[PDB]
Assembly symmetry: D2
Homo-oligomer: 190 residues x 4
Amino acid sequence: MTKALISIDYTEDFVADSGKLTAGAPAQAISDAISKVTRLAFERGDYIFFTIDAHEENDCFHPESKLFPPHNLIGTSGRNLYGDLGIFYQEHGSDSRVFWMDKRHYSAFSGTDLDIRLRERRVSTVILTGVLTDISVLHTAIDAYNLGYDIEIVKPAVASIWPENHQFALGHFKNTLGAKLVDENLNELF
Amino acid sequence: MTKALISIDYTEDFVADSGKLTAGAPAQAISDAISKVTRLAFERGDYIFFTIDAHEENDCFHPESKLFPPHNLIGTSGRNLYGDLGIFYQEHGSDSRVFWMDKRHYSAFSGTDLDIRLRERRVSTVILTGVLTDISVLHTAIDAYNLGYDIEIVKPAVASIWPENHQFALGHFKNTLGAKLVDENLNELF
Amino acid sequence: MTKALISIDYTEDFVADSGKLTAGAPAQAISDAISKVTRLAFERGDYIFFTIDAHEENDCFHPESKLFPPHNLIGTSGRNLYGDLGIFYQEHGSDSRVFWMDKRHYSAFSGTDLDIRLRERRVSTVILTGVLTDISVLHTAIDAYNLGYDIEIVKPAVASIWPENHQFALGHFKNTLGAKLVDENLNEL
Amino acid sequence: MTKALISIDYTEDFVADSGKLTAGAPAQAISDAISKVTRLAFERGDYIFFTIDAHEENDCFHPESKLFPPHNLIGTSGRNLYGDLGIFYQEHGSDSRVFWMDKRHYSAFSGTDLDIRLRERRVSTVILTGVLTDISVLHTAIDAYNLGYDIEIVKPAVASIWPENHQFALGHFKNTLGAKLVDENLNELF
Ligand SMILES: NC(=O)c1cccnc1
Ligand SMILES: NC(=O)c1cccnc1
Ligand SMILES: NC(=O)c1cccnc1
Ligand SMILES: NC(=O)c1cccnc1
Ligand SMILES: [Zn+2]
Ligand SMILES: [Zn+2]
Ligand SMILES: [Zn+2]
Ligand SMILES: [Zn+2]
């Protein structure tokens, strides 16, 4: 069956050394795996959803503005996809199976039309990749669970700034959400 | 109390003579009232949400594609706001209290972040304007009702192709949704 | 594949002569068709969801309280299913494919777990029956549309007190929601 | 200023020594604080929502069935509120400001009418209590955040079976959700 891979916030501001809200080394370490798994999913016929923070510096009505420094600002290089994943987007961004969705909350579902697009395509399984494991990925996974999706987490293609938080989230995915943990070849991990 | 005015699909494709899905004369007849009530709402400090159909011609996954001819296509003049309402947007579009939201369903809430933006601002009352009364306006109103908003309908600033459908919708707003019917001066109608 | 039939508000208070918010004769006229189509859907292996108004008197926080007289009050006979449809529920209510869901808004989806139950079963098509065509049925249909369900409307198994409103709703289902209008044999009209 | 206290899954099966899915001693340890803070909120005129797991044996369509042993089964003692909280419910459950809501997912919002009831009362702040901090409480908190509620967490009135998961969740509430941590007297903890 055809699935959907969700690419969560893997942008310059979350990954690069000078990124405004960078997760640093652990985020950079998944660059090869996240691009590889995305290409693999696309090649086999899956839908690809880039779900990307789209913030505005002067937005005092957003509770998040008080919690983190400005990041992924609309019209800035901070929103550019990091590494070879960006090259994949140059090659296939205009394809009918590839989507770019701006989001304001951590979850890829919140205030977006992600659920609608998935339901149009009768997709029952989402495959999650990106950063941070315990924030945008976690919120997306919980929303996916409540919306009745089967969930796959690409373990080597998610990362957090805190190793303990990364480990909590992975445990939560498997034990509470019943997610399948998979590698960069989309093979289950035992 | 600060309210929000929702401006629904009042574009060239729904209003102009040559509009791809035009409501024709009844839609054109509300041009003065819809621009007047929007400027009045903006001047008093209300939030203004332009919630506009954003369709793609090649979208075989959208059930609406089979129901209506192509309308409000991306990058076309069909998506331009009709009359003085368009002029108002050119003057005040970049103001912090004015919003543009692309939508794919009839309802202004479906797959958008309208509810999120309204709740950020603690808005309890929505004021509905636009076309068509029995489709995009009706769906928006029903969603607003289920989301617990108080509803105001600007009767002289909503219109449909079918008079019987326009009349059904107005009756539904008042008797089933408990909406207040108001004029272009935002005064209740008796 | 396996579809779900939604049975909307077909209770004493909406149908019977003495019903608190009765649609009267037009609602009573669909009794045979609504019971027949529900029994048919169940025989075909479909899921059946009874989605029924569950109101409380003196619920001042509900906006509907000011719009309609008290109806379908919790613990009252007004919530009893009307006619042979009630007999069907007595017979098959304990079956794993048959559900009873209390609702407070007109739409069967609003504040309920209907969508969750349907998605658990990977249901892609809902079949709508009940009353009123232009209120609870219409709201349920619109929610179903926005939630990406294919929709079937059993034309002889929906009713309103207002003929013009019933007609509007049927047109809206077909032309705006892209719903299939079907008969009591579940054949397209 | 009228708030709503949410009492999440504080029942025999999650708390009692012989509970089917018991969090054990840490859950038992909060019994005094959770009952005290609930009685306080009620005295202050707040709404009280008991949001309680309602599961069925042989519910093969529920993904949770494969993740945890049977717990909080409808019609069983497992669903009984633990400690003085249960006594409070006997005393005041029939009050108009006190609600009992059955739920099937971890989040108190998922498939329930919680949001609807809160919006009816124009509640803007939810106060969270119960178990487990990193499951039902966490999911409820994340849903509350996405739905635009201000969040208070009663720190001494939430618990998990795993202390490290409790710590993660508390950090997540404060740093990611912008929640206020409060004590059993509803005073902010600094
Ligand atoms: N990508 C993320 O997890 C994230 C973290 C903090 C703020 N916004 C997004
Ligand atoms: N604006 C509308 O009511 C409408 C009608 C048909 C299709 N899309 C939008
Ligand atoms: N069943 C209905 O359509 C209905 C109408 C009015 C109030 N409640 C329910
Ligand atoms: N109360 C909870 O956190 C919980 C944990 C596991 C299953 N169901 C509920
Ligand atoms: Zn962000
Ligand atoms: Zn359209
Ligand atoms: Zn009702
Ligand atoms: Zn449970």
